Amino acid sequence: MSKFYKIWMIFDPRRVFVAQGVFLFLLAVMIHLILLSTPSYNWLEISAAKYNRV
Amino acid sequence: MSKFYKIWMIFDPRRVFVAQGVFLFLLAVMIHLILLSTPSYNWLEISAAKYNRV
Amino acid sequence: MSKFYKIWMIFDPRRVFVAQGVFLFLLAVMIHLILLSTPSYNWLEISAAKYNRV
Amino acid sequence: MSKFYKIWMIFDPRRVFVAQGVFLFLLAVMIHLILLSTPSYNWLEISAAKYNRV
Amino acid sequence: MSKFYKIWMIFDPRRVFVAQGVFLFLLAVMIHLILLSTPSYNWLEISAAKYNRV
Amino acid sequence: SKFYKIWMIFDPRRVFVAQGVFLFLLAVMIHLILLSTPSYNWLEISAAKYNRV
Amino acid sequence: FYKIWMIFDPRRVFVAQGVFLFLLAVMIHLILLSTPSYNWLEISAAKYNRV
Amino acid sequence: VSEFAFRLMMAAVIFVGVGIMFAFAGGHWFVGLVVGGLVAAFFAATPN
Amino acid sequence: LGYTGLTDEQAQELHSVYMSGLWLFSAVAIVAHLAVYIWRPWF
Amino acid sequence: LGYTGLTDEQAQELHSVYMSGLWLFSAVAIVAHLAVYIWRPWF
Amino acid sequence: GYTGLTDEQAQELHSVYMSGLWLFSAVAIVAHLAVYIWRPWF
Amino acid sequence: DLGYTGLTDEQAQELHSVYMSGLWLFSAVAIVAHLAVYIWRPWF
Amino acid sequence: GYTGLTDEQAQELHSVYMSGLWLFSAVAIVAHLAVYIWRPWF
Amino acid sequence: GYTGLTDEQAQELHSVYMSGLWLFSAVAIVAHLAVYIWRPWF
Amino acid sequence: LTDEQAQELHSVYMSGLWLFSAVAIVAHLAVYIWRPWF
Amino acid sequence: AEYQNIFSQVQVRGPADLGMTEDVNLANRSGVGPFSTLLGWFGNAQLGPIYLGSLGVLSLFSGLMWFFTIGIWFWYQAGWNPAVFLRDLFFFSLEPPAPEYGLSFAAPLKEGGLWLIASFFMFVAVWSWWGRTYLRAQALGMGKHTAWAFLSAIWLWMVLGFIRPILMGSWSEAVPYGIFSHLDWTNNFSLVHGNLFYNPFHGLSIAFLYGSALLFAMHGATILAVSRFGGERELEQIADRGTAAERAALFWRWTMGFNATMEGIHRWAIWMAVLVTLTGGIGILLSGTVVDNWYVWGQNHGMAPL
Amino acid sequence: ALLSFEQKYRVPGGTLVGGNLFDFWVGPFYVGFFGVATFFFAALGIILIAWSAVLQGTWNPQLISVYPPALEYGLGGAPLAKGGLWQIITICATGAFVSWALREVEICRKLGIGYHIPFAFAFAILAYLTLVLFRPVMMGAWGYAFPYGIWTHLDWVSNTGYTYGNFHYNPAHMIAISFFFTNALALALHGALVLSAANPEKGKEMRTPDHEDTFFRDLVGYSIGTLGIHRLGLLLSLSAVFFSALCMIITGTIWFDQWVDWWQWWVKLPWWANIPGGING
Ligand code: BCL
Ligand SMILES: CC[C@H]1c2cc3[nH]c4c(c3C)C(=O)[C@H](C(=O)OC)c4c3nc(cc4[nH]c(cc(n2)[C@@H]1C)c(C(C)=O)c4C)[C@@H](C)[C@@H]3CCC(=O)OC/C=C(\C)CCC[C@H](C)CCC[C@H](C)CCCC(C)C
Ligand SMILES: CC[C@H]1c2cc3[nH]c4c(c3C)C(=O)[C@H](C(=O)OC)c4c3nc(cc4[nH]c(cc(n2)[C@@H]1C)c(C(C)=O)c4C)[C@@H](C)[C@@H]3CCC(=O)OC/C=C(\C)CCC[C@H](C)CCC[C@H](C)CCCC(C)C
Ligand SMILES: CC(C)=CCC/C(C)=C/C=C/C(C)=C/C=C/C(C)=C/C=C/C=C(C)/C=C/C=C(\C)CC/C=C(\C)CCC=C(C)C
Ligand SMILES: CC(C)=CCC/C(C)=C/C=C/C(C)=C/C=C/C(C)=C/C=C\C=C(C)\C=C\C=C(/C)CC/C=C(\C)CCC=C(C)C
Ligand SMILES: CCCCCCCCCCCCO[C@@H]1O[C@H](CO)[C@@H](O[C@H]2O[C@H](CO)[C@@H](O)[C@H](O)[C@H]2O)[C@H](O)[C@H]1O
Ligand SMILES: CCCCCCCCCCCC[N+](C)(C)[O-]
Ligand SMILES: [Fe+3]
């Protein structure tokens, strides 16, 4: 709990930050793509049907 | 049980944490995707049918 | 009988533990997937039928 | 925080700047491509329909 | 009969134990799969028919 | 007698490994052939005898 | 015919002889099992009305 | 003939024989092929 | 057992912090499973 | 322990800055999720 | 032996491994009991 | 040591200042572009 | 003569191996009795 | 010998291997008799 | 290989072959009694 | 008989080589793995050490997620049945969206969305690996020949999966992720566009693949033939030409009238290999976009009877 | 021419046939018994191809085709206008290829090097003879061989492949394609690695084999070595050609149906033959 900082004792900060950024970016893109795949959450299609567009 | 700590005198903490993180993420993604492929547990389709969206 | 503690004299704890973890996880995953593919033990489908979710 | 400036004491500026340039270029191209692939947000087709050019 | 221990003077314990563990696991899996294939010994379908789960 | 001279030409490790592989393969083959014939398929004989099917 | 052991290596001779003799025996047994006339399991099944 | 070559011919003969016998035992040519191939590969990998 | 050049007290400290993280993760997972079960039981 | 050669104070300062970054990211994510749930609840 | 572990080291390592094995088996026993009561397979 | 890259605290702080100036410029232009697109054709 | 194990070491190793084999065989015999009482194959 | 074993070592190896063969044959004969009374193939 | 070694190996191999043939003849005769082949 | 220098007679083992330092970050280089005798009969026995950097981490995670997406789709397609998974492993397929979706990202997860997710993962993985091949050569002071030779294969990969589907206006034009299904895609691609034999750039790609096999059989045989003079040490023969390089040159000069150098043969090699995918990408990019029937095109261009 | 180092290597000897009768050079080329034979066979083959073009009625190089005899002729001779010219040209091609290999053997003997190159060429000759001699003879007709045309032998490839549905499903075809692809990949990697070691970043010193080993160990975690890569190339090419010859020798002789149906043996294995689900359930 109040002792976590010691990750930085055993893990190189550069490796941890690079891996974390890679993971966050990939996960965010995956979630956005899943949302675009679902017809009920594709915001572009939702707004097209809401405003009577092509 | 009060003596598991010496597992850290056998295994490298960095290797253990990297493998554990990868394994846990893959297991969580597998479970979430299995739930999505299940018609009664796809929360996106459940909410689409509930709110009459698609 | 109670002399099994010598097994670690012959076998490296690292390899034994890694192999045992991999084997146990793979066996558990196979058993879970066999149960899921079985229509009479698919707990998600059983709950769906029980609660009329489709 | 008011102490983010030390991220430059950890990471090489050249690598960070190149990574940002590549990431921003690819993100912008990806978003523009998705918008073009969406018929309701393809601005060339919207202008063709609006001004009766085809 | 009282001299079998000398097998260990000719066979390395590591290789013998690994080979025996692999052989035991493969034999057990084969027998379990053979029982599963026969409809009269497939315990999952036996219980499914007994309790009318399908 | 004098068969012990066989442990003058071949390595005992190889002899024992080969003989174990041989015996296991032979036993598996005979059990599988018995399971192939319905006359000596004890699972099927048990199913027929107890009306399990 | 004792010169074989100074002409041919005893290890190879014994290994080849064992392999070929075992293969010959199993092939003869399987040929017998193939033909219904001498298939002893089938003969017993017919005799005791097992099938 | 070298020891490895003799091991190779013995592996081929063992492969053929075990393949035939386990194709008969398992009721399919693939079971015999698997058993014979594994046995011959193990035999050929351990020469003098 | 000295396989990684790690002292006994350092192992105790690292295990203490690792298990603190493990129990935080497990408590969050228990709350999530409880919420899902109340929302849609799977038994 | 130590593998990357950081003192106690250095590790504490780095952890403080990383935690600040994590809290800003999580606060933005919570605001975004609340906005989406108001727009279209997924439950 | 091959690993170079002392006798007391083997004692302690096996004690801890067995404690973990017993915990895993106890959890497995409870899980199997719950499944069998819920939906028996015999 | 004080870092891996070999930058003084002052070098790093100056570089971060210039970086944040560039980031704020890019973000202001992006905000204006998003506002213009939303007024022209909203997606919500 | 290849592993270098002494007489006492070989006897100890075989004694532990035999203890394990008897434990495994006893568990298998109990399981087989349970299965036979459930569904005999003879 | 080619294997490098002594006369006594070969004698002892053959003795113990023969004892194991006799044990295996005894078990196999008991099993074959059990099968024969259960279902003769002749 | 020595001449004496070759002679001893031939002796033991011939003894094994004679035992093999003694078993084989009894087996063949028993099969013929059970089911003659012609 | 005669030693042909194809499998080593004697294996010698020493301390594992940790590699050159140069300008490589040694903290990102792992430890040496085990030694493989089975591999040592043919080449080097030593496994590792490997370099794992930022681009390495990105490439591994992206490729792992690509494989994971395809595999979990396969497991869903099997009904979570392991036996069905093994039975139909070569028959599973992750297919692109249907043609009615065009290039849009609105296709459902089971009807094209999951393929798009896997394709994004593969895109990131492959481009990260290209950057890795560039940077690993840069760290050692080497020329970037590997990176630009990999770009030639990346060109065909991009045309097959990204560029030609965009130019054709649909993601359905792209290749499915499956064993037998991408073979089916290849056959149907040839059938839809007339005959891909009559594509001149398909013919050039086949010529350069055949020539790669030709040239690298010739080069391997030549180096094994002069390995008795230390011909496999090609860098030292470039720096200090020996009788191995001279005999190798003279064999081919006396055979076919011209030869190469110990350096320029590898220029021939790199170009013959890269031209396969270099011409293949152009041939695929011209199919459907410029030529819809390659047999009629060949008829109009003197390649087939009219 | 002569190379600056050529003169000390041009010595008498190393000839299988002819002795010193043909032991000389024409320009850079070495002539022997088999060099003279190669020239005769190649010249006759090319001239007969030109005459076949005269008979066919086209001078377009891409439209010239020399067709084998019809199926009605079986394995017998055919009129020169129909398939006899093809048979003579095939004999000339076989003579030229075998004489080329034997001339290479003579040159190898003269230079004191290994016979790896003629041996590797014999594999290509064997694949060619499989396509023109062994498979047609097994099948019973010269008309199953391919014609000698730039684009008509592609027609033969297409027709032969589609006789058995999609030819991708031939398993030895799959193995041969894997070998061909792996060989092209390995050739690219080997050329690139040698060039990158010999041509570093400008101003830098030549790199050593240590740097090559280091670079592929950094990249993929394994380096096969300077000898290993050339052995690997020889075996990859020869394996690809061997499995090509095998997939064609089994096709139409022991397999007569659609190759896609062959894979149903794995699907119809007894234990998972009837499990519902998946693709084949
Ligand atoms: C009916 C079948 C069709 C046919 C339709 C096709 C189609 C369609 C194509 C070809 C193409 C090719 N065909 Mg064709 N082809 C036919 C018949 C033939 C015949 C023959 C004797 O009949 C020959 C020898 C060929 C041969 C070839 C090659 C010359 C060429 C493939 C180049 C290559 O190496 O791609 C393999 C290399 C790649 C695909 C690039 C790989 C690079 C990427 C980056 C790899 C990443 C790996 C990934 C990350 C996985 C990682 C895994 C882990 C590392 C383990 N064709 C006919 C008429 N053919 C291709 C071409 O380009 O020609 C125009 C092509 O697109
Ligand atoms: C010139 C054209 C030819 C060519 C060239 C070529 N290919 C190349 C190169 C070159 C010059 C490289 O430099 C590059 C390379 O690295 O070569 C070794 C490469 C390469 N060509 C490859 C493949 C390839 N090339 C092909 C073809 C060709 N390549 C052409 C014939 C083909 C075909 C014919 O289909 C294939 C399949 C790769 C081996 C490599 C590029 C590898 C790459 O980008 O990998 C990315 C990773 C993935 C997408 C998948 C990862 C899957 C893993 C399961 C991830 C997870 C791993 C896990 C975390 C491990 C954990 C371990 C611990 C638990 C112990
Ligand atoms: C076996 C592995 C690969 C391989 C290896 C290989 N090839 C080789 C060698 C080796 C080791 C040589 O040493 C030898 C050589 O010297 O190369 C420069 C050769 C060679 N491989 C060649 C070509 C070649 N190799 C091919 C393939 C392969 N070669 C394999 C993939 C192909 C393909 C796939 O199409 C071709 C075209 C030559 C460059 C050369 C042999 C030259 C030769 O035989 O010279 C004497 C003969 C002539 C000068 C020509 C005779 C012409 C005939 C009389 C008439 C025409 C007949 C022909 C069948 C018509 C074809 C019509 C249509 C089908 C186009
Ligand atoms: C150095 C010191 C002092 C200390 C170090 C600290 C250490 C060591 C810490 C480690 C503590 C922990 C967590 C230990 C954990 C141990 C565990 C989970 C052990 C678990 C064992 C489980 C076992 C065997 C299970 C075996 C099961 C088998 C065959 C099953 C076989 C099944 C078959 C054949 C399938 C049959 C059915 C079908 C085919 C349908
Ligand atoms: C047991 C477990 C757990 C797992 C098992 C895992 C298993 C079985 C895996 C099986 C994997 C298999 C079969 C893979 C077969 C693959 C094959 C043949 C591929 C062939 C060709 C592929 C090609 C050209 C792909 C090209 C793609 C490209 C250029 C780029 C695409 C980019 C896009 C479309 C991005 C789109 C998204 C955004 C813009 C956000
Ligand atoms: C090493 C190569 C692969 C191994 C060698 C395989 C050679 C071919 C098999 C030779 C032995 C005969 O093998 C046998 O063939 C028949 C052919 O229907 C199949 O046998 C099947 O039909 C027969 C009757 O014909 C039934 O009695 C049997 O129950 C059934 O499984 C199996 O394949 C196998 O029982
Ligand atoms: C020396 C260790 C370098 C990487 C350390 C990163 C912290 C642990 C990351 C675990 C999770 C891995 N992953 C890929 C799922 O993000
Ligand atoms: Fe080379």
Swiss-Prot record, chain F:
Ranges of the Periplasmic topological domain: 36-53
PROSITE patterns in UniProt: ANTENNA_COMP_ALPHA
Record-linked InterPro entries: Antenna_a/b (IPR000066), Antenna_alpha (IPR018332), Antenna_alpha_CS (IPR002361), Light-harvesting_complex (IPR035889)
Classification via SUPFAM superfamilies: Light-harvesting complex subunits
Pfam family, one: LHC
Residues of the signal peptide: none
Single biological process term from Gene Ontology: photosynthesis, light reaction
Major site of localization recorded for this protein: membrane
Cited function: Antenna complexes are light-harvesting systems, which transfer the excitation energy to the reaction centers.
Membership in a protein family: Belongs to the antenna complex alpha subunit family.
Entry protein name: Light-harvesting protein B-875 alpha chain
UniProtKB/Swiss-Prot annotation, chain P:
Keyword Transport: yes
A GO MF term: metal ion binding
Residues reported in the UniProt entry to bind Fe cation: 219, 234, 266
Mode of membrane association: Multi-pass membrane protein
Residue positions binding (7R,8Z)-bacteriochlorophyll b: 182, 202
Binding site for a ubiquinone: 252
Keywords in alphabetical order: Bacteriochlorophyll, Chlorophyll, Chromophore, Electron transport, Iron, Magnesium, Membrane, Metal-binding, Photosynthesis, Reaction center, Transmembrane, Transmembrane helix, Transport
Subcellular location: Cellular chromatophore membrane
Gene Ontology BP terms: photosynthetic electron transport in photosystem II
Domain of life from the UniProt record: Bacteria
TM stretches of this protein: 53-79, 110-139, 142-167, 197-225, 259-285
Gene Ontology CC terms: plasma membrane light-harvesting complex; plasma membrane-derived chromatophore membrane
Function: The reaction center is a membrane-bound complex that mediates the initial photochemical event in the electron transfer process of photosynthesis.
Subunit field text: Reaction center is composed of four bacteriochlorophylls, two bacteriopheophytins, two ubiquinones, one iron, and three highly hydrophobic polypeptide chains (designated L, M, and H).
Family listed: Belongs to the reaction center PufL/M/PsbA/D family.
NCBIfam families: pufM
Record-given protein name: Reaction center protein M chain
Swiss-Prot record, chain Q:
Leader sequence residues: none
GO cellular component terms, semicolon-separated: plasma membrane light-harvesting complex; plasma membrane-derived chromatophore membrane
GO biological process: photosynthetic electron transport in photosystem II
Ranges facing Periplasmic side: 56-82, 139-170, 251-281
Subcellular location: Cellular chromatophore membrane
Keywords linked to the UniProt accession: Bacteriochlorophyll, Chlorophyll, Chromophore, Electron transport, Iron, Magnesium, Membrane, Metal-binding, Photosynthesis, Reaction center, Transmembrane, Transmembrane helix, Transport
Amino acids binding Fe cation: 190, 230
Keyword Transmembrane: yes
UniProt membrane topology term: Multi-pass membrane protein
Binding site for (7R,8Z)-bacteriochlorophyll b: 153, 173
Primary site of residence: membrane
Database matches in NCBIfam families: pufL
Subunit architecture: Reaction center is composed of four bacteriochlorophylls, two bacteriopheophytins, two ubiquinones, one iron, and three highly hydrophobic polypeptide chains (designated L, M, and H).
Family designation: Belongs to the reaction center PufL/M/PsbA/D family.
Name of the protein: Reaction center protein L chain
Gene encoding the protein: pufL
